[PDB]
Paper text:
Patients exhibit severe movement disorders and neurodevelopmental delay, with a high risk of premature mortality.
We then transfected the [name]‐KO cells with two [name] catalytic variants, [name] and [name], which resulted in loss‐of‐function and an altered profile of dopamine metabolites.
Author numbering:
A (entry chain A), B (entry chain A): 1 to 322, 355 to 480
């Protein structure tokens, strides 16, 4: 295809995408296909001659869409939101023409330059401590990573390299491997699986810190674990504190664990992949207090700040401890929405979260398990885990809305996450009515 | 922005991208900006109110473009090609609406299903051994990774896990760390830096195998290194053989090193990130002979098969040893070009490579350093390294074309890589005339 035909087909695809988005409430949010559905519907080999664009788009509607989970449907309340905004989409189109690979500054200067400025824009929007900013010859700075999982891995490897060099300087008699089997990393028992993944990749031990009644990491639990592990010969070197846990959106207490990590010379990485976006609002910035103690901080604009994946924003206090023109998406989103537009987006989602919480709190058959702070509500029917497993199965099997659960200690808990860019109060109210009706069916069945 | 405004701005961006592509030969391929140029031209903070789309696109032309290295200009002959095709661009637009995160099948079934089929399509196009295919209940299969660097890391970690379990089964007296400081990985002395990066991440030693006169890894050099390292107590566990080295597009001899790796129980990973795309052509498939001995194989459609980054295709013989709907781009590209369209694209680039080689071979002031096989020509002025460093500096400073060099043993060598989708014989001839003129200037200066 040449540019003249792209002029036609590109505008046709713009209309197709806009049509899909405008009619997305008519789509069943979760598909009815079963594993392996697609292979019988597609030829076994690539075509030798070209297919037509019309044939391909027809296949998207007929055989791709039936297997799509519509993350941007207003009735998608699962996991955490995925960012999709038209400003980011417009930037991605330009990236296909002027993006490259960005491994060096000379690969394309604009790519590296814009990223440095955009991370300063975002760092100032979050009112981050100035030690994290690229700006005004600060020793710190930010980079865009592909994912929070990658950012956590990068922080662990930087911490691993630093502690090996430190221990070898103190005792030149030590090899890297002898240090390796004594290193231990820490995280909450509510930490995302990416922490364990990073520990396995890095080849170090990982231990979970028991959380308190609010599922937060506290000084007393951390000090108890350090006392045990240091006596056993382990060397704490890395810590992932989480602001906005994937299970219940709880917050580790940075004001308590930060000073401890600094004292112990433990690299403190703050994983705020979801919750970090809300810290651009002054009423939520207090949830980030204590980040001044962290050695690295990370959150995903590609969850809840409307910058289409991939865009994971990581700041490090000292850059010396440490691609797709992904900063173009950030630039577009920040400029076409403005800081106030992004703040209104965050606040609407949090308002809608409290609206669902209000409905659950009106039904004494249910209970709220964790304090509602951002766009997540953790709730369950009072009683057995099995009645709640039945409720979740009935919900996801009806495929009108989509939820995922979690385990809080031994308790099976349902999650309600505000996700879609276009979700409204009516969608939240309808979802609750659906959940309430199915709960009556499930409660009926348990007593009969 | 809502969908109705995206209808307008999306089609406007289609026209802007098409205009850029159609006029790209009027762009200076490499920019004249210096590091730090962008920050004074952009405000220090994000706007509170939204900016207009017109303001943003004007900024792209006025302040972004001057710092862009135009990888898709016909006069870009540096590194290796970056894939940019309109079929892939059309798929990326749809991915912004129906893509998600694809961590599980249930996250969006179509994403996982299409990837499995597309890797079988591509595996059959490469005539890969059937042990690599997802198809017909084969134990092997392919996945799309974000980069060849990531694919090599994934293979190393899989090899690391397997050898630790094997040695602990043979000797339960061993810890993971005690095994770690004995493991050694291998690669050619022409291997990409990603191999060293993977070894550092994985925490294992890496040693280079000396290449032969054709810069290929051979059985004799590998056996010499194994004899030395096994006697020293090292445990070979992982090997990266390269088809199409980044320095000079040489090819490690798989028919020789494959059987050795199988005997030694060394995981053989084949890195063919650039050259792999040509193996869809029968006249180049012989360069892949011996892949039947490999445990994993990888190449980048996002270099030289027109599938916009990111798309790295990795096959593993046994899947049990082991996101963005990136398979949609593969599906679109394969269908709108056809196998024959992709074959014609590969063959044109190789023809153009031989056309440049023919011109260099007509000038006895120059020499060809390595056999020309695919879209890369390694050449230099006869004589000192310094006269060649001067030639490269004069070339890249004129900014009419863009080249990068490499070192072959102690020899400074210039690379000429066919990159752009729209490069023609006229562009290659003009570049040679430019190189020839600057060589006269530089040769003059050395003798005066």
């Amino acid at each position: 295809m040449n540019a003249s035909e792209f002029r036609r087909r590109g505008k046709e695809m713009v209309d197709y995408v806009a049509n899909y988005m405008e009619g997305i409430e008519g789509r069943q949010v979760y598909p009815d296909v079963e594993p392996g559905y697609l292979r019988p519907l597609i030829p076994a080999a690539a075509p030798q001659e070209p297919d037509t664009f019309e044939d391909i788009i027809n296949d998207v509607e007929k055989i791709i869409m039936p297997g799509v989970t519509h993350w941007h449907s207003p009735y998608f309340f699962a996991y955490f939101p995925t960012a999709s905004s038209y400003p980011a989409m417009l930037a991605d189109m330009l990236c296909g023409a002027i993006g490259c690979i960005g491994f060096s500054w000379a690969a394309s200067p604009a790519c590296t330059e814009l990223e440095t400025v955009m991370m300063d824009w975002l760092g100032k929007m979050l009112e981050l401590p100035k030690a994290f900013l690229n700006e005004k010859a600060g020793e710190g700075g930010g980079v865009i990573q592909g994912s929070a999982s990658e950012a956590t891995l990068v922080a662990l490897l930087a911490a691993r390299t630093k502690v090996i060099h430190r221990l070898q300087a103190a005792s030149p008699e030590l090899t890297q491997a002898a240090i390796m089997e004594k290193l231990v990393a820490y995280s909450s028992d509510q930490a995302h699986s990416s922490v364990e993944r990073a520990g396995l990749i890095g080849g170090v031990k990982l231990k979970a810190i028991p959380s308190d009644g609010n599922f937060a990491m506290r000084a007393s639990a951390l000090q108890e674990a350090l006392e045990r592990d240091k006596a056993a010969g382990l060397i704490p070197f890395f810590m992932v504190a989480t602001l906005g846990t994937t299970t219940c959106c709880s917050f580790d207490n940075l004001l308590e664990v930060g000073p401890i990590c600094n004292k112990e010379d433990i690299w403190l990485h703050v994983d705020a992949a979801y919750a970090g976006s809300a810290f651009i609002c002054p009423e939520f910035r207090h949830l980030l207090n204590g980040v001044e103690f962290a050695d690295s901080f990370n959150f995903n604009p590609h969850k809840w700040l409307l910058v289409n994946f991939d865009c994971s924003a990581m700041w490090v206090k000292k850059r010396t401890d440490l691609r797709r023109f992904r900063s173009l998406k950030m630039w577009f989103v920040f400029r076409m929405y403005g800081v106030k537009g992004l703040q209104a987006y965050i606040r609407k989602h949090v308002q809608l979260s409290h609206e669902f919480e209000s409905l659950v709190r009106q039904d004494p058959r249910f209970e709220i398990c964790v304090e509602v702070i951002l766009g997540l509500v953790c709730f369950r029917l009072k009683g057995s885990n099995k009645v709640n497993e039945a409720l979740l199965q009935r919900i996801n099997s009806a495929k009108k809305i989509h939820l995922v659960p979690c385990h809080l200690r031994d308790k099976f808990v349902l999650r309600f996450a505000i996700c879609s860019r276009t979700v409204e109060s009516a969608h939240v109210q309808r979802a609750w009515e659906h959940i309430k009706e199915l709960a009556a069916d499930v409660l009926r069945a348990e007593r009969e």
